[PDB]
Structure 1
Amino acid sequence: MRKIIVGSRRSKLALTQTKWVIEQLKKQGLPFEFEIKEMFVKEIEQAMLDKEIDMAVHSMKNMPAVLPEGLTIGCIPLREDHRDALISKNGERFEELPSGAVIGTSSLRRGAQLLSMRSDIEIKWIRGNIDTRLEKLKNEDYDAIILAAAGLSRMGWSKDTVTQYLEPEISVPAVGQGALAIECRENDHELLSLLQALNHDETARAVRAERVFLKEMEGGCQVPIAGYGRILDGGNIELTSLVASPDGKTIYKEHITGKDPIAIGSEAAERLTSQGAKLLIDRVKEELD
């Protein structure tokens, strides 16, 4: 009887993710209707607090570090590929790219880590969805681009479209990359129970440590900040956390393994802030203004 209203972005990726979640939730056979309402992060959240919509599906790396009171992340499904992906026009791996090669990405996080590995290449802004950026790679003045492996996966691109999957040792992923967030109201106990079966605890634990570090550093998509957690055999969370200068010449990196997501994320931020990472972040945020 109850029709769950799911608010979604207009883009092809967002609607693809939203339909995937709805089809997943339907496998539980519980009596709910689902209906997408095409609707900015503030607009979605206020519409959810206004109860105009009941939930929304976002890429976790696009979630704000701080949710407004009354809203929660109700479900984090099994994580897809977390890695950044290099796609080279002429098929060169990162270490094979010619001197001065132009790599297209508008993410300071991605560009700064690449420049920290090779400062003889250039990072240049690029816009468009996956299909657009891939076509720009064939023409134009880019020697390679960086995309999220999970985005390529969810958009039906073959794994062999990627020239090189970047391991965290070369590029620490954005916090939450490869994960989805289902946002809903904190007191919507009915929806929360429905979302429980889709939640993957191991993914949620790791992402929770990433997000605590992101929150305590006041980070976001515009900040060269990165964090990736995974569950080790025995239950320990391993968190790699990184803050980089835009030019790639300053790298704050912290590796922490432990049991508690909040404790690990908190220590990561504390250790990096004491070295000067927070001062770097504030300078980059100022330079954007």
Structure 2
Amino acid sequence: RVIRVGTRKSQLARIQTDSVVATLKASYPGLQFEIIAMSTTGDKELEHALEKNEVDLVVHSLKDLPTVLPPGFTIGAICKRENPHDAVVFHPKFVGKTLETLPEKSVVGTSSLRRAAQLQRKFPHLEFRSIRGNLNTRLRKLDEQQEFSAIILATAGLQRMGWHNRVGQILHPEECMYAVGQGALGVEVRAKDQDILDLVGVLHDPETLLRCIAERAFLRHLEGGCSVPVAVHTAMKDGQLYLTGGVWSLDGSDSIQETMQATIHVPAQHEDGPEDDPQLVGITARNIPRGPQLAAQNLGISLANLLLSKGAKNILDVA
């Protein structure tokens, strides 16, 4: 009767949830939608409300979701990708500059091993240091203190906040390839709740779905997760799916980067697929043709094996 949407009580999480509910309300104007925000402390917590039928769907950043969700849960929707690239926000004293033009030994703030490793490699004159907090906290640390000359953040996050204008530089893949699933939202639901799966299925963007299957199958086959120096770049053009992937030592000195492609046409039409089909890297998309889904998963596995053949595991085990 009433679709309940669970959400973390944080701000980027609530913004993300609201944009999804809004898209669902566009498709289903005749349906009641309710947002329930939950304390994760007391003043997985979301999954607990799902299996307990206290909410019906939960919106996540796709890169925050592990490569295999616990059974009973699935990613029922991969929404159209927002900007996937990493961005730089500069200290007030350094607006108008670039990472090349920052003074040597300027400190750049990031807690992402993927970002630090890639950017140490490409800008040795800089230092990268851990910084903590949500986006508002890191921006207050950048603005009010003199410790950091710049911070690294996901563009997509600054755009959900409406803080576009704090982006000084957007990193091209030759400087910093993005995280698996960066910029795409993922809708987690009960694996067996067919009504809600069909319902959120309207949000699958076929292209984003496939490139995020390729990226997640690549990540899973390297046995990785959110916090590892692995990075990817995908694109679909001319009927081809291009997957570029890389791994880095924490300092960035050891690296492996390779690319493969496969013929995979972006599906136009929706279909009534089988309900018995197993999920792919934690994703369920019965309304999208299964073939391209499986081809995209195969592209991720292949590249991962090629990296593994070149010694990617000994780099990852040390991280």
Aligned to 1:16: 15
Deviation at 1:116, TM superposition (A): 0.9
The superposition leaves residues 223-282 of structure 1 with CA deviations (integer Å, 9 ceiling, x where unpaired) of: 111123221122x11111111111011111121111321111001111111212112212
Residues 94-103 or 108-117, more deviating: 94-103
Letter in 1 for 2:208: T
**Which of 28, 39, 45 in structure 1 is aligned with 2:47?**
45
TM-score, length-scaled by structure 2: 0.84
Residues 173-182 or 270-279, more deviating: 270-279
The superposition leaves residues 169-221 of structure 1 with CA deviations (integer Å, 9 ceiling, x where unpaired) of: 11010111110000112222222222122221111111110000111112122
The structure 1 segments of at least 4 consecutive aligned residues displaced by more than 4 Å after TM superposition are none
- 1:92-241 to structure 2, matched below 5 A, reads 92-140=97-145, 141-158=147-164, 160-234=165-239, 236-241=240-245
Count of residue pairs brought into register by the alignment: 280
| Aligned-partner Cα distance in 2 for 1:257–1:95 | 32
For the Cα contact (< 8 Å) 2:254–2:315, is it kept in 1? no
| Aligned-partner Cα distance in 1 for 2:4–2:219 | 29
Aligned to 1:245: 249
| Aligned-partner Cα distance in 1 for 2:102–2:79 | 36
Identity %: 45
**1:86 match: secondary structure:** strand
How large is the RMSD of aligned CA atoms in angstroms?
Answer: 1.5
For the Cα contact (< 8 Å) 1:99–1:120, is it kept in 2? yes
Deviation at 1:30, TM superposition (A): 5.5
TM-score, length-scaled by structure 1: 0.92
For the Cα contact (< 8 Å) 1:176–1:228, is it kept in 2? no
| Aligned-partner Cα distance in 1 for 2:136–2:163 | 10
**1:94 match: secondary structure:** coil
Aligned to 1:71: 73
| Aligned-partner Cα distance in 2 for 1:72–1:184 | 6
Letter in 2 for 1:3: V
Letter in 2 for 1:150: A
Deviation at 1:10, TM superposition (A): 1.5
Aligned to 2:89: 87
**Which of 299, 302, 315 in structure 2 is aligned with 1:264?**
299
Structure 1: segments with no counterpart, 5+ residues: 285-289
| Aligned-partner Cα distance in 2 for 1:98–1:47 | 49
Correspondence 1:283 to 2:282? no
Deviation at 1:43, TM superposition (A): 2.5
Structure 2: segments with no counterpart, 5+ residues: 264-294
**1:173 match: secondary structure:** coil
Deviation at 1:31, TM superposition (A): 4.2
| Aligned-partner Cα distance in 2 for 1:64–1:32 | 31
Letter in 1 for 2:63: K
For the Cα contact (< 8 Å) 1:207–1:228, is it kept in 2? no
| Aligned-partner Cα distance in 2 for 1:245–1:212 | 21
Residues 78-87 or 190-199, more deviating: 190-199
